[PDB]
Amino acid sequence: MLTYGAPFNFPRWIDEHAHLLKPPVGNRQVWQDSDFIVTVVGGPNHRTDYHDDPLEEFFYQLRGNAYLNLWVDGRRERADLKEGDIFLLPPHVRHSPQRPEAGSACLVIERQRPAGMLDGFEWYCDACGHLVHRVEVQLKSIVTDLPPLFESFYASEDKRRCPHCGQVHPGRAA
Ligand SMILES: [Fe+2]
Ligand SMILES: [Fe+2]
């Protein structure tokens, strides 16, 4: 049967979930227990962590504008997600999404990761660019598997300390 239910109007769904598409929640997954992880991400939200996804990520910036801070070819780059833009991110490209605008909405589509295929989350030194800390996770649920990871980095000067220049990373806000 239709495990994930009947078709429904997407703009209306987004409107009805507007209260979840802003802090502190910020995002909302559309269907549960599906292979395709379909999420709408709102704003505002700024962050310092970079994601290393072992699979591809599809973006369609439906409302408002956002941007991804990236590492490409060993250098810091920015991919703008202007309203109306689509984008396909290859596996393992490190990315830190920034969503400055309230009322923005981005469709993000990913795949469930098989057992053994791990996600990485990491931070880089603002002073010398060296990797400061990386955690790998078997990502089953973003809601329980991810916030403690971030929280543990912010709470530890050891985790935040650059091994190259010794600068302590700011933590939650750059
Ligand atoms: Fe990601
Ligand atoms: Fe450093």
Asked if 162 and 132 count as a contact pair (C-beta separation under 8 A), the reply is yes
Amino acid at 117: M
Known binding positions for Fe cation: 51, 57, 95, 125, 128, 162, 165
Which homologous superfamily does the CATH classification assign to the domain defined by 9-174? Answer: Jelly Rolls (2.60.120.10)
Resolution for the entry shown, Å: 1.5
159 Cα–ligand 2 center, Å: 13
Question: Cα–Cα distances in Å, from 101 out to 10, 24, 131?
Answer: 20, 14, 29
56 Cα–ligand 2 center, Å: 29
Residue whose pair of structure tokens reads 């050891």 in the numeric block: 158
**Closest to 39 measured CA to CA, from 67, 59, 9, 55:** 59
Asked if 74 and 124 count as a contact pair (C-beta separation under 8 A), the reply is no
Contacts 24+ apart (CB under 8 A), 124-128: 124/50, 124/71, 125/162, 125/164, 125/165, 125/167, 125/169, 126/167, 126/169, 126/170, 126/174, 127/162, 127/165, 127/167, 128/162, 128/164, 128/165, 128/167
CA distance 146 to 142: 5
145 Cα–ligand 2 center, Å: 27
41 Cα–ligand 2 center, Å: 31
Give the up-direction half-sphere exposure of residue 12: CA atoms within 13 A in the CB hemisphere.
Answer: 3
121 Cα–ligand 2 center, Å: 18
Known binding positions: 47, 51, 57, 95, 99, 110, 125, 128, 162, 165
124 Cα–ligand 2 center, Å: 8
84 Cα–ligand 2 center, Å: 37
